[PDB]
Structure 1
């Protein structure tokens, strides 16, 4: 039935719904179906320094023996400083994105300097860094977390803060390359009803869907909300897991599919 698709693609506009429906009926190809994507928070983990990074380096060097790992980094508080500065000047979201990408790239460099003796490199193009993943003595890579939307970033309804950041930069990379698992390593056991660092009455949440997550009308979340709309619209990755990297083993248990922290499902 590809003839109709081909005769539509050349005639109609890509906004033609008949065309979109024909395209949705096309095949699916997972590029790294055996790979697992994880996101190391910057403000959550790396900005804590040794106590939080060395154990995770150990866990990673241990886990690459059994899993393929795509390790994305967060930006952290340097990015928040930059955002504050630039917003004080009235600069748009694209610039702020240019700026945060760099903090993420910094953190990636620091992390890859710790893993170079273990054969784990830092790579620009994570997705087609094929070699290191085909191997068992490497089986992992570190990149940024920030997406390439440097200046063409979709601005938010209100403000200049880029809504699509490291969280999205990792999730989308997972969804594209058809990875099997997506994990967010942060400074909390998972998602609560409110920021526990501010409100110690907040309640834990082991599992939830996107719709329920919105209905709760959360003022603050452990993930970027746009990631939810992205997850609801994805094809391969239909769930993500958030865990605490300060707790030893949680990451390893999660890579094995175990339910350790919070699980967020599109449906």
Structure 2
């Protein structure tokens, strides 16, 4: 709880290949989380277990035709199956946890996740059975259904539990001046609103906004005594060193 972590879709899945899990990475990241000894609450993304189908059927644009209902069900099962594999690696590393699918628990209205009943999540956290949220299709009070991002799930948990630290884990050392497809890429030290408004593009299946949307969430979640970090989960032991407080190459808001 004290340190709120998002395991991004870019590290836990092969974002260019539908339904392709990165088990070795998730296992290591879970091991680094336990080794750090920190009090932690983990969210994860859908990656290629949700974005490929959601983009093909424009699920985030709302319920427009009936061909979307089977695709949404398929995508929901795919992402719940990804969550089980994440939870499996957590349990194996000594971190009791359980998937909490927002599309089975909550609703959406105007791009916001509506969490009317916080008791199950708070009781699970109190018991020590870490509630693990993740991006999902969610019923929408206007568009029939919508998509909530794990990024916003981080925001809900942040205002719910007030963490001391917020850590996003993705396949990049941090936010750059431009995507590391141009070799003029320059790592950005500290995120401010102006330093991003920076070239942020999307070259893989995406539905929830990419690095730019994660940056806004990071900027929104900063407070008087709360830093928000983006760290490269593909760098061995870098997440462990961050939770321990050691110096790591990363971006902070």
3-state SS of 2:83 partner:
helix
User: How far apart are the structure 2 equivalents of 1:224 and 1:120?
Assistant: 32
Q: CA deviation at 1:145?
A: 2.0
The equivalent position to 1:257 in structure 2, one of 241, 245, 253, is: 245
Find the counterpart in structure 1 of residue 38 from structure 2: 67
Give 1:208 deviation, angstroms: 2.0
Q: Do the aligned partners of residues 172 and 260 (structure 1) sit closer, same or farther apart at CA in structure 2, a change above 3 Å counting?
A: farther
Distance in 1 between residues matched to 2:164 and 2:175, nearest whole Å: 21
How do 1:1-267 and structure 2 match up within 5 A?
A: 35-47=2-14, 49-63=22-36, 66-87=37-58, 92-93=61-62, 102-117=77-92, 118-124=94-100, 125-133=120-128, 141=130, 143-146=132-135, 149-152=138-141, 162=147, 164-196=148-180, 198-214=181-197, 216=198, 218-219=200-201, 223-225=211-213, 228=216, 231-232=219-220, 238-265=226-253
Whose strand fraction is larger, Structure 1's or Structure 2's? 2
C-alpha change, 1:173 and 1:248, in structure 2 (3 Å) is same
Count of residues in Structure 1 that have an aligned counterpart in Structure 2:
215
* Cα distance in 2, alignment partners of residues 57 and 128 from structure 1: 23
Gaps of 5+ in 1: 1-31, 134-139, 155-159
> Max radius of gyration: which structure?
1
- Shift of the 57–225 alpha-carbon distance from structure 1 to 2, 3 Å rule, reads closer
- Name the CA distance, whole Å, in 2 between partners of 1:171 and 1:82: 25
* Larger RCO (CA within 8 A; separation ≥ 6): 2
For the 8 Å contact 1:243–1:262, the answer to whether it is kept is yes
User: Aligned partners of 1:103, 1:260: CA distance in 2, in Å?
Assistant: 34
- Does the 8 A contact of 2:242 with 2:248 survive in 1? yes
Secondary structure of residue in 2 paired with 1:260: coil
Residues 1:83 and 1:116: Cα distance change in structure 2 (over 3 Å): same
* Post-superposition offset of 1:178: 0.6
